[PDB]
């Protein structure tokens, strides 16, 4: 199949700035390359088709160019609504294939997370499991590291995490991490700590509680 590789994975820009996105094809797709925008919870929206034609009703600030194996989507001046995921797509050959996507996000000042730890409730402990939650609030950029520690021992393979979409008002991210173990395993230990590394922090921040 024809493989489409987009670059960069993430563009970080301010409103009003010019955005340039690239698509590289494993072999020539001639002119048969389309661009789509996608926002959370929505179907893709067609922007550009046959490399350079604007889809019906798409704003003038969107344009595409290129041929063969090299393509570009340009947003002349970014509007707040343009911060989204973009995909290129070919059909010079079957199967029809898509690029892996480029995210365009709002660049803002570096902001350190506000860190909070939450012990499991007494209500949950009754059911025989214990979840310990670490919250990282309102930070920029997206890159952050959470390290769980139980009585100073580094945990691995027993936590899951999730990150919000970039906030519309302040352009920050937030992160939640859950450490999960059974009641019995939980009662065997005293100190539960969440260590946070981020580029807005001079050194890692730790929050803990004693069981």
């Amino acid at each position: 199949e024809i493989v489409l590789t987009q670059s960069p994975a993430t563009l970080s820009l301010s409103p009003g700035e010019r955005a340039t996105l690239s698509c590289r094809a494993s072999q020539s797709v001639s002119s048969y390359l389309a661009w789509y925008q996608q926002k959370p919870g929505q179907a893709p929206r067609l922007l550009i088709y046959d490399a350079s034609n604007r889809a019906t009703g798409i704003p003038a600030r969107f344009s595409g160019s290129g041929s063969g194996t090299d393509f570009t989507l340009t947003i002349s001046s970014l509007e707040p609504e343009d911060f989204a995921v973009y995909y290129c797509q070919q059909r010079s050959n079957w199967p029809l294939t898509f690029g892996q996507g480029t995210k365009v996000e709002i660049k803002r000042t570096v902001a350190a997370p506000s860190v909070f730890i939450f012990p499991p409730s007494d209500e949950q402990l009754k059911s025989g499991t214990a979840s310990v939650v670490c919250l990282l609030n309102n930070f920029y950029p997206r890159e952050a590291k959470v390290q769980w520690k139980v009585d100073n021992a580094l945990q691995s393979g027993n936590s899951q995490e999730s990150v919000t979409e970039q906030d519309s008002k302040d352009s920050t991210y937030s992160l939640s991490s859950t450490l999960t173990l059974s009641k019995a395993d939980y009662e065997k230990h005293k100190v539960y700590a969440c260590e946070v590394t981020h580029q807005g922090l001079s050194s890692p921040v730790t929050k803990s509680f004693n069981r």
Binding site: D50, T97, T180
Partner: protein, 213 residues
């Protein structure tokens, strides 16, 4: 000028089959090709195959050949995608779209259909408080539900400022877990009541939980 309207969300056990419909309103269904494209949670787009309803001719991606059958009924302007021998990895939103053979693009798209494949059974969540420490942060942990989605609001949906509701994670038990938090002034902890309202529409479950220090 054309609406593509898909059937509702599906929940299936491994090994079973799902059939999703895509009804077109507007335009000329007989002059169109219809493609099916899927997207797993947080991943990219994958083409499955297509059909030309006027000829009944269908094609498929090789990765799916044998598992996917695409059909169409001209009399009802409806296309169908059947995916059999379902596995967990088939959990995704499935889209129908109009494929334009002149340039190779997909212009009209359906709203999408969520298909969740798992051995788990439709189950309501347990809601546990994330009590504020002794600006403060408090929240709720919405644990052990199936399938997606859940909605969380604070104080009957009236408190919206400073709320973050995180994407759910999929646990190895096959059940989902989500947290929702809100930052508030510490001074209001003594007076202001905080309740998280959880609605799991797939199990028709409504849970309220007051979060106190």
């Amino acid at each position: 000028q054309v609406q593509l309207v898909q059937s509702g969300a599906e929940v299936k056990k491994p090994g079973s089959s799902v059939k999703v419909s895509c009804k077109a309103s507007g335009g000329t269904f007989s002059s169109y090709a219809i493609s099916w494209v899927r997207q797993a949670p947080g991943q990219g787009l994958e083409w499955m195959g297509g059909i030309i309803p006027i000829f009944g001719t269908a094609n498929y991606a090789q990765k799916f050949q044998g598992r996917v059958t695409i059909t169409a009924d001209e009399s009802t302007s409806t296309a169908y995608m059947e995916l059999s021998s379902l596995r967990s990895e088939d959990t995704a939103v499935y889209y129908c779209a109009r494929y334009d053979g002149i340039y190779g693009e997909l212009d009209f798209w359906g709203q999408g259909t969520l298909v969740t494949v798992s051995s788990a059974s439709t189950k309501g969540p347990s809601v546990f408080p994330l009590a504020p420490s002794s600006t403060a942060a408090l929240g709720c942990l919405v644990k052990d539900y199936f399938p997606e989605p859940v909605t969380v609001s604070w104080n009957s949906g009236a408190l919206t400022s400073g709320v973050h509701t995180f994407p759910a994670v999929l646990q190895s038990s096959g059940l989902y877990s989500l947290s929702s938090v809100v930052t508030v002034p510490s001074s209001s902890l003594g007076t202001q009541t905080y309740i998280c309202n959880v609605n799991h529409k797939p199990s028709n479950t409504k849970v309220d939980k007051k979060v106190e220090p």
